[PDB]
Amino acid sequence: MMYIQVLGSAAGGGFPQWNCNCVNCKGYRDGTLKATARTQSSIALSDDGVHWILCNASPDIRAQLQAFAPMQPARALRDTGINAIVLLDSQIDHTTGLLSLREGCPHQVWCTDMVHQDLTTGFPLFNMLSHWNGGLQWNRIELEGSFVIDACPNLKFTPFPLRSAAPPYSPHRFDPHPGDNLGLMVEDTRTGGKLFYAPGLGQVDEKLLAMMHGADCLLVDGTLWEDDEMQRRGVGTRTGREMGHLAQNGPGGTLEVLDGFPRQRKVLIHINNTNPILDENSPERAEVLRRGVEVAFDGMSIELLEHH
């Protein structure tokens, strides 16, 4: 059994975003919209339900850990359910949470060379936190092969490079390298059950589709409904293809991609505050439900029993 816990399901900024008064964020505050608040994307994995692996550490991490009981087993005066942390990129929304975990250092952190470089230069988390009882102990994620964290020995992670979208602070935002962004394939080596996790998805080729058909659950990018969604809300100028996000609707959309996977469980995660799928009375939400696609939410439990 693989326990998957959605701690956060919103894109950077959360929902509602602190400075946004779009139809969703204002509709939530005014109470004229059936929607649920969401923290920034983060999931937790376990093979036993006691030892947990954190995938990305959001700025909302303190609230995310409180809301989930197994994170505090109370086995000692100082304790936590987090046994390791895996980083998919060096983005602010996925790494800032590490600052809030300074009291429980050291931590085993799994990231790539490129992420480790960003987190030792532009955003030197590894250098800052080292002053807290050991800090972050880096475990390299090589772009090939697989890795197993000793706390969840039945979990097999097989990373794959996705199209690079390096953070703005990054020394090489203008010079993208493989290793800037990862999608994860987690396998329960007891059952063969596979999870395809890719909150940041901006390009999908035929070799990516190949391994997706070997998965049982697809947990992927759901940031935007339209590529120009930020303009249609009048809160931004950036498009999904600029930010490296494949929108649900349109040609080469996620809904077009996911349509070739009728046998897999399909969940949209990392959802921006402007996305109408957050509105449960929205026709967009209807089309998503109609296609057998779920909209992740804070507190969602995904249990992986077996392979099909």
Q: Which residue is nearest to Mg ion (CB)?
A: 12
In the complex with Mg ion, the residue whose CB is nearer, 93 or 188, is: 93
Instruction: Specify whether the CB–CB gap between 4 and 195 falls below 8 A.
Output: yes
Closest contact distance (angstroms) between CB of 31 and Zn ion is 15
Q: Which residues contact residue 161 at a Cβ distance below 8 angstroms, ignoring those fewer than 6 apart?
A: 143, 178, 179, 181, 182
What number of chain residues touch Zn ion (CB under 5 A)? Answer: 5
Cα 107 to Cα 112: distance, rounded to the nearest angstrom: 16
Give the residue carrying structure tokens 């050291």.
106
Could you say which of 31, 32, 78, 301 contacts a copy of itself (CB under 8 A)? 78
In the complex with Zn ion, the residue whose CB is nearer, 80 or 203, is: 80
Closest contact distance (angstroms) between CB of 283 and Mg ion is 26
Instruction: Specify whether the CB–CB gap between 184 and 86 falls below 8 A.
Output: yes
Interface mask toward a copy of itself for 123-142; x: CB under 8 A: xx--xxx-xx----------
Could you say which of 34, 36, 49, 62 contacts a copy of itself (CB under 8 A)? 62
In the complex with a copy of itself, the residue whose CB is nearer, 131 or 291, is: 131
The encoded tokens of residue 36 equal 């649920």
Interface mask toward Zn ion for 4-33; x: CB under 5 A: -------------x--x-x--x--------
What number of chain residues touch Mg ion (CB under 5 A)? Answer: 3
* Stretch touching a copy of itself by CB under 8 A, among 120-128, 180-188, 200-208, 278-286: 120-128
Give the residue carrying structure tokens 């964020």.
25
Q: Does 93 bind Mg ion (CB under 5 A)?
A: yes
Q: What value, to the nearest 5°, has the Cα angle with vertex 64 and ends 9 and 290?
A: 25
Q: Which does 53 bind (CB under 5 to 8 A by kind): a copy of itself, Mg ion, Zn ion, none?
A: none
Cα 219 to Cα 269: distance, rounded to the nearest angstrom: 6
**How crowded is the C-beta side of 105, counted as CA atoms within 13 Å?**
21
* Stretch touching a copy of itself by CB under 8 A, among 118-126, 140-148, 241-249, 296-304: 118-126
Sheet harboring 42-46: ordered strands across? 136-140, 107-111, 82-86, 52-55, 42-46, 2-8, 301-304
Cα 225 to Cα 284: distance, rounded to the nearest angstrom: 8
Instruction: Specify whether the CB–CB gap between 24 and 36 falls below 8 A.
Output: no
Binding site for Mg ion (CB under 5 A): 11-12, 93
- Residues at the contact surface with a copy of itself, assessed by CB under 8 A: 12-14, 16-22, 26, 29, 59-63, 65-66, 71-72, 74, 76-80, 92, 96, 99-104, 122-124, 127-129, 131-132, 168-169, 173, 233-235
